[PDB]
Design a protein around this motif. Sequence first.
Motif, PDB file in Angstrom:
ATOM      1  N   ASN A   1       0.821  -1.205   0.000  1.00 34.03           N
ATOM      2  CA  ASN A   1       0.000   0.000   0.000  1.00 34.03           C
ATOM      3  C   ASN A   1       0.854   1.252   0.000  1.00 34.03           C
ATOM      4  OD1 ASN A   1      -2.550  -1.169  -0.093  1.00 34.03           O
ATOM      5  ND2 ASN A   1      -3.311   0.091   1.600  1.00 34.03           N
ATOM      6  N   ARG A   2       2.142   1.094   0.301  1.00 35.64           N
ATOM      7  CA  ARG A   2       3.124   2.172   0.316  1.00 35.64           C
ATOM      8  C   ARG A   2       2.651   3.342   1.177  1.00 35.64           C
ATOM      9  NH1 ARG A   2       7.254   0.153  -2.534  1.00 35.64           N
ATOM     10  NH2 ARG A   2       8.592   1.625  -1.403  1.00 35.64           N
ATOM     11  N   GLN A   3       2.461   3.066   2.464  1.00 32.17           N
ATOM     12  CA  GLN A   3       1.992   4.088   3.388  1.00 32.17           C
ATOM     13  C   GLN A   3       3.116   5.049   3.765  1.00 32.17           C
ATOM     14  OE1 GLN A   3      -1.484   3.010   2.673  1.00 32.17           O
ATOM     15  NE2 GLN A   3      -1.154   4.713   4.098  1.00 32.17           N
ATOM     16  N   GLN A   4       2.736   6.298   4.019  1.00 23.90           N
ATOM     17  CA  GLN A   4       3.657   7.336   4.462  1.00 23.90           C
ATOM     18  C   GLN A   4       3.250   7.807   5.851  1.00 23.90           C
ATOM     19  OE1 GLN A   4       4.573  10.377   1.270  1.00 23.90           O
ATOM     20  NE2 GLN A   4       3.256   9.029   0.051  1.00 23.90           N
ATOM     21  N   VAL A   5       4.215   7.859   6.766  1.00 23.09           N
ATOM     22  CA  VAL A   5       3.969   8.214   8.158  1.00 23.09           C
ATOM     23  C   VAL A   5       4.829   9.418   8.519  1.00 23.09           C
ATOM     24  CG1 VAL A   5       3.095   6.053   9.093  1.00 23.09           C
ATOM     25  CG2 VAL A   5       5.545   6.330   8.711  1.00 23.09           C
ATOM     26  N   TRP A   6       4.193  10.452   9.071  1.00 25.61           N
ATOM     27  CA  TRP A   6       4.904  11.646   9.531  1.00 25.61           C
ATOM     28  C   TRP A   6       5.375  11.429  10.970  1.00 25.61           C
ATOM     29  CZ3 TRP A   6       7.651  14.989   7.378  1.00 25.61           C
ATOM     30  CH2 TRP A   6       7.318  15.577   6.154  1.00 25.61           C
ATOM     31  N   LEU A   7       6.436  10.642  11.092  1.00 28.42           N
ATOM     32  CA  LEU A   7       6.971  10.312  12.408  1.00 28.42           C
ATOM     33  C   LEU A   7       7.801  11.471  12.952  1.00 28.42           C
ATOM     34  CD1 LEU A   7      10.279   9.484  11.953  1.00 28.42           C
ATOM     35  CD2 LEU A   7       9.188   7.496  10.903  1.00 28.42           C
ATOM     36  N   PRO A   8       7.676  11.807  14.237  1.00 34.07           N
ATOM     37  CA  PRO A   8       8.532  12.854  14.811  1.00 34.07           C
ATOM     38  C   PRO A   8       9.967  12.364  14.931  1.00 34.07           C
ATOM     39  CG  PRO A   8       7.237  11.826  16.532  1.00 34.07           C
ATOM     40  CD  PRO A   8       6.754  11.234  15.233  1.00 34.07           C
ATOM     41  N   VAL A   9      10.914  13.238  14.593  1.00 29.49           N
ATOM     42  CA  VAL A   9      12.314  12.849  14.483  1.00 29.49           C
ATOM     43  C   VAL A   9      13.153  14.120  14.487  1.00 29.49           C
ATOM     44  CG1 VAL A   9      12.114  12.781  11.979  1.00 29.49           C
ATOM     45  CG2 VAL A   9      13.969  11.501  13.083  1.00 29.49           C
ATOM     46  N   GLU A  10      14.442  13.977  14.810  1.00 34.63           N
ATOM     47  CA  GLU A  10      15.369  15.104  14.753  1.00 34.63           C
ATOM     48  C   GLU A  10      15.310  15.815  13.407  1.00 34.63           C
ATOM     49  OE1 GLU A  10      19.405  13.957  15.013  1.00 34.63           O
ATOM     50  OE2 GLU A  10      20.173  15.977  15.400  1.00 34.63           O
ATOM     51  N   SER A  11      15.228  15.049  12.317  1.00 30.26           N
ATOM     52  CA  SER A  11      15.095  15.595  10.963  1.00 30.26           C
ATOM     53  C   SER A  11      16.258  16.517  10.608  1.00 30.26           C
ATOM     54  CB  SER A  11      13.757  16.319  10.788  1.00 30.26           C
ATOM     55  OG  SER A  11      13.811  17.622  11.342  1.00 30.26           O
ATOM     56  N   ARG A  12      17.466  16.121  10.997  1.00 34.13           N
ATOM     57  CA  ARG A  12      18.683  16.840  10.647  1.00 34.13           C
ATOM     58  C   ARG A  12      19.576  15.931   9.816  1.00 34.13           C
ATOM     59  NH1 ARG A  12      23.149  16.928  11.388  1.00 34.13           N
ATOM     60  NH2 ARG A  12      23.192  15.489  13.167  1.00 34.13           N
ATOM     61  N   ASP A  13      20.165  16.491   8.758  1.00 36.37           N
ATOM     62  CA  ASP A  13      20.993  15.734   7.818  1.00 36.37           C
ATOM     63  C   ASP A  13      20.214  14.546   7.255  1.00 36.37           C
ATOM     64  OD1 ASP A  13      24.256  15.476   7.124  1.00 36.37           O
ATOM     65  OD2 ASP A  13      23.183  13.567   7.053  1.00 36.37           O
ATOM     66  N   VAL A  14      19.103  14.841   6.587  1.00 34.82           N
ATOM     67  CA  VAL A  14      18.255  13.835   5.957  1.00 34.82           C
ATOM     68  C   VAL A  14      17.946  14.308   4.543  1.00 34.82           C
ATOM     69  CG1 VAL A  14      15.984  12.769   5.944  1.00 34.82           C
ATOM     70  CG2 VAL A  14      17.277  12.912   8.079  1.00 34.82           C
ATOM     71  N   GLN A  15      18.296  13.491   3.555  1.00 33.71           N
ATOM     72  CA  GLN A  15      18.101  13.830   2.154  1.00 33.71           C
ATOM     73  C   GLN A  15      16.993  12.973   1.556  1.00 33.71           C
ATOM     74  OE1 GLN A  15      20.959  16.379   0.647  1.00 33.71           O
ATOM     75  NE2 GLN A  15      19.917  16.623   2.621  1.00 33.71           N
ATOM     76  N   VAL A  16      16.099  13.616   0.799  1.00 35.11           N
ATOM     77  CA  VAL A  16      14.958  12.915   0.224  1.00 35.11           C
ATOM     78  C   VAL A  16      15.433  11.880  -0.789  1.00 35.11           C
ATOM     79  CG1 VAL A  16      13.106  14.561   0.638  1.00 35.11           C
ATOM     80  CG2 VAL A  16      14.729  14.956  -1.222  1.00 35.11           C
ATOM     81  N   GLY A  17      14.664  10.801  -0.917  1.00 35.64           N
ATOM     82  CA  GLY A  17      14.989   9.723  -1.822  1.00 35.64           C
ATOM     83  C   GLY A  17      15.981   8.711  -1.293  1.00 35.64           C
ATOM     84  N   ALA A  18      16.506   8.908  -0.086  1.00 35.03           N
ATOM     85  CA  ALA A  18      17.484   8.002   0.491  1.00 35.03           C
ATOM     86  C   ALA A  18      16.790   6.793   1.113  1.00 35.03           C
ATOM     87  CB  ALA A  18      18.342   8.734   1.523  1.00 35.03           C
ATOM     88  N   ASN A  19      17.588   5.803   1.503  1.00 34.14           N
ATOM     89  CA  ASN A  19      17.093   4.583   2.122  1.00 34.14           C
ATOM     90  C   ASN A  19      17.595   4.506   3.556  1.00 34.14           C
ATOM     91  OD1 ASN A  19      19.640   4.255   0.630  1.00 34.14           O
ATOM     92  ND2 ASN A  19      19.661   2.193   1.519  1.00 34.14           N
ATOM     93  N   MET A  20      16.669   4.335   4.496  1.00 31.12           N
ATOM     94  CA  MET A  20      17.012   4.168   5.900  1.00 31.12           C
ATOM     95  C   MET A  20      16.262   2.969   6.459  1.00 31.12           C
ATOM     96  SD  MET A  20      16.235   8.112   6.864  1.00 31.12           S
ATOM     97  CE  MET A  20      15.925   9.158   5.450  1.00 31.12           C
ATOM     98  N   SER A  21      16.431   2.746   7.761  1.00 32.29           N
ATOM     99  CA  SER A  21      15.811   1.629   8.462  1.00 32.29           C
ATOM    100  C   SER A  21      14.961   2.176   9.598  1.00 32.29           C
ATOM    101  CB  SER A  21      16.869   0.662   8.997  1.00 32.29           C
ATOM    102  OG  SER A  21      16.316  -0.218   9.959  1.00 32.29           O
ATOM    103  N   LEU A  22      13.727   1.691   9.697  1.00 38.22           N
ATOM    104  CA  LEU A  22      12.806   2.118  10.739  1.00 38.22           C
ATOM    105  C   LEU A  22      12.672   1.027  11.794  1.00 38.22           C
ATOM    106  CD1 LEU A  22       9.453   3.942  10.346  1.00 38.22           C
ATOM    107  CD2 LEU A  22       9.442   1.752  11.523  1.00 38.22           C
ATOM    108  N   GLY A  23      12.736   1.438  13.057  1.00 38.59           N
ATOM    109  CA  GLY A  23      12.655   0.489  14.147  1.00 38.59           C
ATOM    110  C   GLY A  23      11.530   0.767  15.122  1.00 38.59           C
TER     111      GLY A  23
END
Lengths: 286, 334, 373, 371
Positions: D261-283
């Motif tokens: 379904n490719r859901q998008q979640v607006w999770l609260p986070v530091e949001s510093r040094d984050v570039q769009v289109g990158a790949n990360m891991s969610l825990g």
Amino acid sequence: AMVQPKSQKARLFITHLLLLLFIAAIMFPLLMVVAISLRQGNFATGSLWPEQISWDHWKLALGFSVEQADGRIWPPPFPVLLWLWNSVKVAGISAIGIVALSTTCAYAFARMRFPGKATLLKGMLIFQMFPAVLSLVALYALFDRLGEYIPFIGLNTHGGVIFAYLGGIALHVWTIKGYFETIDSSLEEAAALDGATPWQAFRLVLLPLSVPILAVVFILSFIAAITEVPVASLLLRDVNSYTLAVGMQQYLNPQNYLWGDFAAAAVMSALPITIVFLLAQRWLVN
Amino acid sequence: LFAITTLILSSAGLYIFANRKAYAWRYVYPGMAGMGLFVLFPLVCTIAIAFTNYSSTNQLTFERAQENWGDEKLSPGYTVTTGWKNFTRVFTDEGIQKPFLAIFVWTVVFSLITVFLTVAVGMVLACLVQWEALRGKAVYRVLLILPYAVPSFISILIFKGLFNQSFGEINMMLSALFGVKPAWFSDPTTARTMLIIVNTWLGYPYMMILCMGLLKAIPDDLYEASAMDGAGPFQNFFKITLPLLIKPLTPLMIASFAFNFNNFVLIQLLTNGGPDRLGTTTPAGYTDLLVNYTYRIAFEGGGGQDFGLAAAIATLIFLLVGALAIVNLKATRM
Amino acid sequence: ASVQLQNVTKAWGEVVVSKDINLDIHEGEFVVFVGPSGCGKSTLLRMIAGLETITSGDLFIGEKRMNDTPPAERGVGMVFQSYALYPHLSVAENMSFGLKLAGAKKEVINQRVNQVAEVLQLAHLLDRKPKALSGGQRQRVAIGRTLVAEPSVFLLDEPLSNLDAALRVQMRIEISRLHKRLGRTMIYVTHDQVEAMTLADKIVVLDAGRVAQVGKPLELYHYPADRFVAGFIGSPKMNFLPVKVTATAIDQVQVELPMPNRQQVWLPVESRDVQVGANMSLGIRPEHLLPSDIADVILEGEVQVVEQLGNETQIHIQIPSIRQNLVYRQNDVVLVEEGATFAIGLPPERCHLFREDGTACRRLHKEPGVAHH
Amino acid sequence: ASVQLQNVTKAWGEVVVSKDINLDIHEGEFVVFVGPSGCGKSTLLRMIAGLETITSGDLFIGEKRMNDTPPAERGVGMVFQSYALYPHLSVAENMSFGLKLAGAKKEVINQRVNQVAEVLQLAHLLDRKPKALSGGQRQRVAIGRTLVAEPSVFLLDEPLSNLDAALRVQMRIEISRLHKRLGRTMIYVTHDQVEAMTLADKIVVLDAGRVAQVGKPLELYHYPADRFVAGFIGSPKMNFLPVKVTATAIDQVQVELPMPNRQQVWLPVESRDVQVGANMSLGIRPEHLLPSDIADVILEGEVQVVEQLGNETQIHIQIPSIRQNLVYRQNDVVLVEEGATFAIGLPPERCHLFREDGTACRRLHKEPGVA
């Protein structure tokens, strides 16, 4: 208590029979030397295990009495007690020297560390498993040259005997090092933590822990000294100065073979047998 | 020379009170000095004796000055350094090379046979003693160890008496059972056979002790799993115990081989002069190890007391140092 | 197939390690043996395998009586506490020792070895020796050897004892998969309630070589037979409080809390053979404790130790009157300081009663998951 | 008595078993060293004690440089794994060896041992030898020896490896009573995370000879600095879900769930040094996973393992398009059959977003207990 088939009883019977036969074969020489000791004659023959109990050889070997058999009295053949006394002196001095020289080397090789440890241990093994191979010629020449300078370690003296006997340090350092490895390795570190200089750490902590192995080494080397033959036979010449294992040869001589007296002396030497049986074996789980 | 050696031993110089590696060796020196003086020194002296002509004609070093040219040559100089002359004369002479090779072959055969027999007997006895289903195992251990407890020379001389021919005990026992006279001392083959028997009798309990210790080191879960699979006693011994014992037993086999090679005390006490080779310039018997050959050349009166030839260092101690290297390589294994 | 034990008693001379135990393990059942560190469980598995003589009684594998049959003929496979791998033999020879000893068709031997290697993922490490393998590889090799032997009953002697947490969890799931696939009878021994409750279809709790209670894991957790079972099952020790019987109804028993409250509460239990005015023992697990607000019965106490594991908070409560401190456990982090008065609730439904002999009365509160299978 | 390891590096020969460790332990703090490699933690403790040489850096016991001070004068007391108990000496001799070496005086050597035996419950057997002791008694003698020594800092190894469960519990109890009774600086070594969580004023997660994070236990739990510590803390490993970022705000980052379904979640986070289109891991932790009905973001998958532990049930759900079976814990019991489909919820506030390298962005969501 694994559940076992009926073949177990047959295996046990066969094993018991085989072991009994083997022990009979092994104990034949010792029982024969015991029975010979009680034989009246010294040239054997006659009956294999005489029923008579003469005891004359024992008293000759003891020296308690001359054991008048006919009109002529029979003086004691050789001073076996003198043999024993010389052997005891030599063995005691050799054992004391071996322990005193070997304890510190065992400590150095086992507990502490130093850059040359690998080479020193390899050389220790290398010169340890040498036997007395041709060193007798060198010892004879050295004592011949030395007796004129210092007689008490020269030739026909106990000094040369003890000097040749102190080599057992190479053999005993391994037993003492094994015991040191057995002892916990954090003891010296803890002692240094409480403020002990390493010499005190050895003297007050680990040295009193070495008493059993030191006693075992003392007994083992005492026995090895008492039962040595080559060097004592080679450089012992005076009739009064003979140790043990060197007059035993004179007991059996083609001019006069002496079964009864030799066997009396041999069973008088029963004490080292019991000592090695119990103290040397130390009732360790074999 | 002795004073210089003792001064070297004393002022090695590594006792500098600096708490450095000096401290460590301050513990090793006592006893390291003992070895360097009581073990290494006789070996180095034996090395030195070989290159000289020390003999019953040259035993004196220099003290005979008066006791013209005054025979100031080489041989009247008594102790002189010849140089590889004694080493060559053990081969090129052919009067002592053939006896040397014969006793060498006999010594190797004797040592190998006695090592194999001793290992087999001791291993079998250990495996049987550790059955844990037997009775009186302590009594059996004591009885099978008794030859080790009896002093060696006593047992050797007891065997010398028992195997006698002039009067004899074992011989006339054998005659009573079925009349035969083995002639142990006279016949070289029977002498070697009695020699092997006596060496095995003396040496079996030690290897029994070693195998008993190794079986203790062996865990019991392997035995239990084999019993689950259905293995019997012999299958267990041949496919569990034996493969896991030869690997830690090879160095022990090699060490016992060396000991049986240099068994001077046994070969000297029992049939020291087993029938002589009858045609040897130096005295030599069929039942003579290399060590006692050299002893015969050294101190036996009929050998001329040729101490220079009596060294034989570069043969005996060189095969012995090869043995050291082999066992040392096996010790670092696993 | 089906292992059954009838009046099995073992006597190591004067001491009787296990006495007259009775078990009925039907075909295919996964049964775990749990208890204290006493070797009674291991000795029981051993006599089942035939490694120890059963002093008295009977042991039935399938139909025939098998008290005096050697382990070779028993059709039983065992893995030991140690992995019992022959160091000299390679992995394949280790697993095929029994087949080599019994049969002679090397084609069959290698076929079975290859099959068990493929199903146990031991193919690429088949040629190696036990020393070079890691702990998981060695355990899988032992399991493969047992599967090669292919017995009617599988015996596990604490297999997940020599491994760390992650590897023991992974091999726990592996053992569960093995049970699901094969379906053969497997008997397990361990000390860990977590492994017992996760794996077993039946649990046998041993007490000094006695069968305390046998049943499903949730069955033990919800209806312990006695004080020992109640204490053993559950990672935090079940809280125990003395109680006095005041009046017994047809299906409930009143108790008095040994506190100045003098409170009386009805607890649904068997209420059979319960004597009025008798010293009793009330028990309640720390998890089931209710907060003070939504509970009528209140235990007021003082906070002694507050442990913040992070996912749950463990609050030790000292009641003014009862000797042992009350243990409280709550989800998430509870911010309570030490030395603070705390109030907690006693849900009367979730209580247990244990008589002076130690036996327990069965509760009348029906619990979910009891009749799952 | 505040040890101040600064830029300390250990070089055992050529392999660096410890990188540039940089800690700061104040006075009267109980600091626990927890890690997977036992040698490195024990090695660091030994360099602290003085039994080991420090290759580079400087150590500060209290307010004095202590790199080259010999072990005796470091004012530290270490409790070895084997307790280094002297067999020939008695219990009292073991406890007062330090005083016996320098000025026994035959008064303090007995007064101190009596006091520490009374406060350690050891006076009734103080005249026995370590051979005639039990495990707890032997540990108590070692502890009493340290107490008689009275060091500025208390160093304890990790001997629980050789211990049993009951003896470990007794150890944990008595060390807790020790710390509460004295309140002096103490260092503890362990490999079990539960021990550190129950007893610590500051936890040092040590990896590959490098300090990963230093902080309180709840601080490590709620705000893990990186992937290693995040996985380390918590017996059920946190469920990791690779994600792709859609947009980045100044206080939150929107990521993409592998779920079809490719859901998008607006999770609260530091949001510093984050570039769009990158790949990360969610825990997301197994405990924090909400039931599907309450949460808006639902993770529907097929159940593989249901582990009923009585108090909780570890439902393993194999989420489609995700290799990992996500561990889900719920209180009480839930009857779920293996092979069926069960849905769970994902709370945005408990997601720990992790960079590609491994560093975790600080969670802007406040959490109770962290202070």
